[PDB]
Amino acid sequence: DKDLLKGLDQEQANEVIAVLQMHNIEANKIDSGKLGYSITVAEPDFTAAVYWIKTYQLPPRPRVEIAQMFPADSLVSSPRAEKARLYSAIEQRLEQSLQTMEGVLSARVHISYDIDAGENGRPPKPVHLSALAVYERGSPLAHQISDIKRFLKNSFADVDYDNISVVLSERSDAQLQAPGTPVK
Amino acid sequence: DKDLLKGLDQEQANEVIAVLQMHNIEANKIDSGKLGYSITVAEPDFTAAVYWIKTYQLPPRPRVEIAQMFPADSLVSSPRAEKARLYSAIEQRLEQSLQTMEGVLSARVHISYDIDAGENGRPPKPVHLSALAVYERGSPLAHQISDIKRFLKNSFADVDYDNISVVLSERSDAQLQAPGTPVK
Amino acid sequence: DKDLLKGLDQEQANEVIAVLQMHNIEANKIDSGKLGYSITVAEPDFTAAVYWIKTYQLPPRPRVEIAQMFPADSLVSSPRAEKARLYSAIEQRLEQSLQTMEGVLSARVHISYDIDAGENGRPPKPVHLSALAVYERGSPLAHQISDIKRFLKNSFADVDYDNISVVLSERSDAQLQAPGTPVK
Amino acid sequence: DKDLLKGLDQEQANEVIAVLQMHNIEANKIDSGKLGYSITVAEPDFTAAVYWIKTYQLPPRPRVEIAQMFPADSLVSSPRAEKARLYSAIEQRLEQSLQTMEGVLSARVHISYDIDAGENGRPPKPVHLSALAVYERGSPLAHQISDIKRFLKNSFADVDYDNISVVLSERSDAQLQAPGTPVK
Amino acid sequence: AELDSLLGQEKERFQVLPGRDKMLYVAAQNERDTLWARQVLARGDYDKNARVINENEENKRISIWLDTYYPQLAYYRIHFDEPRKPVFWLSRQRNTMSKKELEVLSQKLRALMPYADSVNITLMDDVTAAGQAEAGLKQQALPYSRRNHKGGVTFVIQGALDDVEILRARQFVDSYYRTWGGRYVQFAIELKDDWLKGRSFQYGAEGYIKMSPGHWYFPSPL
Amino acid sequence: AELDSLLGQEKERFQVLPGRDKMLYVAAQNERDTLWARQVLARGDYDKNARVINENEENKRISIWLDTYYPQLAYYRIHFDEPRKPVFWLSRQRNTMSKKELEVLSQKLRALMPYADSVNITLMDDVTAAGQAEAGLKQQALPYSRRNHKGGVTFVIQGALDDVEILRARQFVDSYYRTWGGRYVQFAIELKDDWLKGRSFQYGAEGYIKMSPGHWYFPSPL
Amino acid sequence: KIPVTGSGFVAKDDSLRTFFDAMALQLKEPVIVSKMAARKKITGNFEFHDPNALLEKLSLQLGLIWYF
Amino acid sequence: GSGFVAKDDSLRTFFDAMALQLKEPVIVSKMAARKKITGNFEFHDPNALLEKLSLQLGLIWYF
Amino acid sequence: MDDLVFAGNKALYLVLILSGWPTIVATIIGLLVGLFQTVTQLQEQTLPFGIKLLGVCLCLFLLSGWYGEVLLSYGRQVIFLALA
């Protein structure tokens, strides 16, 4: 009943619980009001749980977006801080536009940033895109790489089919059964 | 009865319920007044619901629009901010005018953002569109793609019939029966 | 009787009920003063009503017009914002004039925004229109597509007959019978 | 006694009543003092009243004129705003004068908007007009299309008979009998 | 409570057939009315076992069985204008089955649908199926291109079509697919712009494209 | 409590089969009803032993077993339209097994599936499986490029296809893999940027000569 | 890394001076292209197996005169 | 068979396409290279097409 | 001539907001030196000139980068409309 993490977040504690339940140890989410959450495991299951905290880098950091480092409420807005705030909202809207396809659970899109072509007389370079995806199993995951490339091809000015890269995979096996209490 | 999420919005809570009922587990929605909602499930259906929270990336984020990164409260407005606030309103009016067709349940339209032509000495490039749609089943969804292209062709200045890409699918099987309470 | 939506608007609550009554479940609208309406369904229809909320993306958002992004209450306005408010007032006026024809129930008109024509020495481009319509059944709607094209042709400066695309469709079958209460 | 719309306006309730009474259901108009009017229907015709609200888009919204987008109480007034607040008054004065012909019940006229003709060194473009009308039945409505075109021909500088389009129609069958109370 | 009273007021848009395997089949007419009667059996206000049938779903259900136990079979559609005697349309110029084999096919297809009484198999001609498709495509004044090949024909409708020739072709293809099935003859409404948009070319067996007044290009013979 | 009452309301999407090894197998149809019937057996509201089977995954479990005890076997697919009696679609022109050892193969396949009663082995032809795949690929008006080799056919679909040709090719490959399985014939749909969809020519002194299919493609200036 | 099995010259926007230099091993004499005829360009896949007939066909299609 | 589809050419790129059917090279002068022509053309009798097109356009030729 | 007045009216809008924020910080601290002397008056008139100078040059330092961004953006827009 020795505690190991406290003051967590609502989105963090469900990830620490979902990782520990995969490795046959149970955890308990104890609310504390103003301070936060806490996670307590049993006494013989403390040695294994510290090793999976160290391995999985828990707790997870909050996810970083490029528009967070040039805030709109700041008193400065350079043209670099506008071309980097527009591109950071397009690759978030494309990722939310990718979760509504047939059989996709998660996706992540990266745009290549060019910022100083408009300052100088040289023309801008071509645009490169890259995307990851996680599909539900039972899907023939060799054939869905052309529907995403057709969707991403003309959502920009002029990209080719060789400057887009989609790397997708199927999800892991489901964890449906309960872990179990250590009999002592 | 162990809770797993709390402080949620109404629109997030209805989608968490509609996802957990897909996987044969029963959830309860508890209103807490000012503090929002909370989703509590039973005891044996906890080890599966914490797995589907991590898998489906729940709770869902609010959907992002491009017109949120350039608010109108700024005293000055660059032409890049004015042309991006205009394109981010055509991007929502076209998808609000696609749901009133025959058979469409949901849609999502994307316009290519060209920003540097209005300030440099360079001529503007062409404009590209890309749309997704979800149709009610029993539809000839190959013949229903040749009037969305006709609809999107002359809603802009000069697009071609190969600069528009439509990736549409049919809806899933309906979930009509109740989950079933966990007996023990 | 469990609730699924609250804090709504008078226009939104009359559309959630109309979606639910199409799929053979009965809802009850409850007024709550200044706190909006609320919609309650029975107990066994709860599993299906969340499925049609998730599918139809209910509640609907308020419809967006282009003149909302450029308010007239601002002090100084660019010509790029005045021409965009002019084309958005013409675009709503042609839509409100199309509903008074013979047999039209609803209509929606879109228009090309040539916003960077007067800034440089290039000539302004031709303009494009695109309209949708829903007709009352019992009409041979193949011959109704040329009167709207003749009406929209010389309502602008210089359009051609292949820069206008009309995609119209008959309405769905009527719903006149009661849903029916579940027995208990 | 179930309400479906409340807080309506005076000319809004005569539109909702005239739509519901066309489809054999009977409504009741109740005042509320400062809150405006309200419309209730009976119990066995509640499903049809919701269906004809959704189909016909009731309640109606105030008609849009171009002079509401360029108000007269502004401090500055560009020549584009002065040139469009003048087109928007002949646009709704020819509509007022078309109603005094022999047989016409309603009409709507649109004019092509030319703004950048006077700014630069190009000559002005030709003017294009379009009009709709609803005639009382029993009229030879094909011989009445050359009098609207003759009246519209020399109300501007120089238009041709190939730049004026009139699309008109006869009214529906007259509704005189009462709907009828639902017996049970 | 009877099932005829558990549905809506209009007792004509559905049809209840007492099955042979101690069940009760409800015959709807489309997909909007199919979910109207699936909500009744799924929310639980009926005691015995019942099933909902359609015409497209029941044609796709016993088409999986003819891809496993009777492969390389030539047929068109199963018509349910009276649900007690379905009509099976078999191809005449592409089969080699005798009278006994058509009887054992009717007796093995009768057991899949327990609500029916006797499936009636009739042999449709093959040249009339493409004659009604070409004479229907010529009445609407549509440009097309017929590609005859082995075991099916193909009509290709391409080019830059306007808004009236889309609507006049969408009303003919749905009325032909409804009565003949998409098994033998298939249409391809491929709407695209003019290929080689503004380029002058010299067509026929030795072809080139002029990308510019001073630029030649020699791809496949245009 | 019986097993067929712990499942959903409609007793038509599941089917309980008694096992020979004192178990009880539930035969679902797809992954959504498989996870529906596995949440029941995983939360633990049942006393005896039970299993969940599936058409897509118990063909893969039996093909892992088949390629360690019977290598160099030519087969296509196991079909489960009657789950108490499956059919094994064996090839004919690529294996040399007699009748007495086809009896041994059927007796060893029966012991792997304790829910079955008799596995029926039939010999499908190897030529019609590829002729159906080509007669259906020509009917959809698709550009393709056949690459025949010994012990396998492959179809390559390259080029800048549009949306209709992508949706028709994806619906044809998904409707073919369910019937035959990708053991003998394989498709290679990919998207490059060239307006000539796969085919390429060289030009000298006589006209055009069709080049051999290779991996390098000419990028299209257009 | 240069994959074609056979022989031939693939030209991508060559400017008729670097194009006829590639035909100067099959035509076994050096080629001299003038200055006004060095502004036209050509692209495609070519194959020289009788270049005296390929030059005769191409000088008529492009519009050229030559002398040996 | 053969033919040329002209879309806003300049009377020099048009007459070089006929320089294969005619077995001689064609030399178009400078003032006659300003007029333009467009439309589908077919070359099956080019000597009669040169005599008819040089009169409808206004041209003189010499072989 | 509609952009001829628009470029002029932008400048009269621009001197307003560019000058208001340094004037109000020369007026709030001038009110604050006068509010404090309701008790312990002890006034000499040349005392708060230095505090007024440190007030405006502090708010000029904090608002310096925004002053350069607005003056460069208005500089770029007027010569894009002049040349094009």
Side-chain angles (χ1 to χ4, degrees), chain A residues 129-143:
Chain A
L129 286 92
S130 43
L132 302 159
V134 171
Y135 268 79
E136 189 78 351
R137 75 172 55 239
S139 179
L141 72 89
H143 296 280

CSV table of all heavy atoms in Angstrom, one decimal, chain A residues 129-143:
chain,number,residue,atom,x,y,z
A,129,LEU,N,5.3,16.3,-46.4
A,129,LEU,CA,4.4,15.9,-45.4
A,129,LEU,C,4.7,14.5,-44.9
A,129,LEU,O,5.3,13.7,-45.7
A,129,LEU,CB,3.0,15.9,-46.0
A,129,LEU,CG,2.3,17.2,-46.2
A,129,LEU,CD1,2.5,17.7,-47.6
A,129,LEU,CD2,0.8,17.1,-45.9
A,130,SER,N,4.4,14.2,-43.7
A,130,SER,CA,4.6,12.8,-43.2
A,130,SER,C,3.5,12.5,-42.2
A,130,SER,O,3.1,13.3,-41.4
A,130,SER,CB,6.0,12.7,-42.5
A,130,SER,OG,6.2,13.8,-41.7
A,131,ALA,N,3.0,11.2,-42.2
A,131,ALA,CA,1.9,10.9,-41.4
A,131,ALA,C,2.0,9.5,-40.8
A,131,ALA,O,2.4,8.5,-41.5
A,131,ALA,CB,0.6,11.0,-42.2
A,132,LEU,N,1.6,9.3,-39.6
A,132,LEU,CA,1.5,8.0,-38.9
A,132,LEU,C,0.1,7.7,-38.7
A,132,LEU,O,-0.7,8.6,-38.5
A,132,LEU,CB,2.3,7.9,-37.6
A,132,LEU,CG,3.8,8.3,-37.8
A,132,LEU,CD1,4.4,8.7,-36.6
A,132,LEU,CD2,4.5,7.1,-38.3
A,133,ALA,N,-0.2,6.4,-38.5
A,133,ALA,CA,-1.6,6.0,-38.3
A,133,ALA,C,-1.7,4.6,-37.6
A,133,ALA,O,-0.8,3.7,-37.8
A,133,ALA,CB,-2.4,5.9,-39.6
A,134,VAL,N,-2.7,4.4,-36.8
A,134,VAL,CA,-2.9,3.1,-36.1
A,134,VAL,C,-4.3,2.6,-36.5
A,134,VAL,O,-5.3,3.2,-36.2
A,134,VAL,CB,-2.8,3.2,-34.6
A,134,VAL,CG1,-3.3,2.0,-34.0
A,134,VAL,CG2,-1.4,3.5,-34.2
A,135,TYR,N,-4.4,1.4,-37.2
A,135,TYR,CA,-5.6,0.9,-37.7
A,135,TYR,C,-6.1,-0.3,-36.8
A,135,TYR,O,-5.3,-0.9,-36.2
A,135,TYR,CB,-5.4,0.3,-39.1
A,135,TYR,CG,-5.7,1.3,-40.3
A,135,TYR,CD1,-4.8,2.2,-40.6
A,135,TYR,CD2,-6.9,1.1,-41.0
A,135,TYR,CE1,-5.1,3.1,-41.7
A,135,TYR,CE2,-7.2,2.0,-42.0
A,135,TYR,CZ,-6.3,3.0,-42.3
A,135,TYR,OH,-6.6,3.8,-43.4
A,136,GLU,N,-7.4,-0.5,-36.9
A,136,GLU,CA,-7.9,-1.7,-36.2
A,136,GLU,C,-7.5,-3.0,-36.9
A,136,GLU,O,-7.4,-3.0,-38.2
A,136,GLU,CB,-9.4,-1.6,-36.1
A,136,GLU,CG,-10.1,-2.6,-35.2
A,136,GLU,CD,-10.0,-2.4,-33.7
A,136,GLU,OE1,-9.3,-1.5,-33.3
A,136,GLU,OE2,-10.7,-3.1,-33.0
A,137,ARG,N,-7.3,-4.0,-36.2
A,137,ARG,CA,-6.8,-5.3,-36.8
A,137,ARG,C,-7.9,-6.0,-37.5
A,137,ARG,O,-9.1,-5.7,-37.3
A,137,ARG,CB,-6.2,-6.2,-35.7
A,137,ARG,CG,-7.3,-6.9,-34.8
A,137,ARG,CD,-6.7,-7.9,-33.9
A,137,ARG,NE,-5.6,-7.4,-33.1
A,137,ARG,CZ,-4.4,-7.9,-33.1
A,137,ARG,NH1,-4.1,-8.9,-33.9
A,137,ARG,NH2,-3.4,-7.4,-32.3
A,138,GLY,N,-7.6,-6.9,-38.4
A,138,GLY,CA,-8.5,-7.5,-39.3
A,138,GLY,C,-8.6,-6.7,-40.6
A,138,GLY,O,-9.5,-7.1,-41.5
A,139,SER,N,-7.9,-5.6,-40.8
A,139,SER,CA,-7.9,-4.8,-42.0
A,139,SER,C,-6.7,-5.1,-42.9
A,139,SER,O,-5.6,-5.4,-42.4
A,139,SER,CB,-7.7,-3.3,-41.6
A,139,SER,OG,-7.7,-2.5,-42.7
A,140,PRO,N,-6.9,-5.1,-44.2
A,140,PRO,CA,-5.8,-5.3,-45.1
A,140,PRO,C,-4.9,-4.1,-45.3
A,140,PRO,O,-5.1,-3.3,-46.3
A,140,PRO,CB,-6.5,-5.8,-46.4
A,140,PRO,CG,-7.8,-5.2,-46.4
A,140,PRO,CD,-8.2,-4.9,-44.9
A,141,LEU,N,-4.0,-3.9,-44.4
A,141,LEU,CA,-3.3,-2.6,-44.2
A,141,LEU,C,-2.3,-2.3,-45.3
A,141,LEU,O,-1.5,-1.3,-45.1
A,141,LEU,CB,-2.7,-2.5,-42.8
A,141,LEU,CG,-1.5,-3.3,-42.3
A,141,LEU,CD1,-0.2,-2.6,-42.4
A,141,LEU,CD2,-1.8,-3.6,-40.8
A,142,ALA,N,-2.2,-3.0,-46.4
A,142,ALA,CA,-1.4,-2.6,-47.5
A,142,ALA,C,-2.2,-1.7,-48.5
A,142,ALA,O,-1.5,-1.0,-49.3
A,142,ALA,CB,-0.9,-3.9,-48.3
A,143,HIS,N,-3.5,-1.8,-48.5
A,143,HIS,CA,-4.3,-1.1,-49.5
A,143,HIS,C,-4.7,0.3,-49.1
A,143,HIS,O,-5.1,1.1,-49.9
A,143,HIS,CB,-5.5,-1.9,-49.8
A,143,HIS,CG,-5.2,-3.2,-50.5
A,143,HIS,ND1,-4.9,-3.3,-51.8
A,143,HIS,CD2,-5.2,-4.5,-50.0
A,143,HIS,CE1,-4.7,-4.6,-52.1
A,143,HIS,NE2,-4.8,-5.3,-51.0
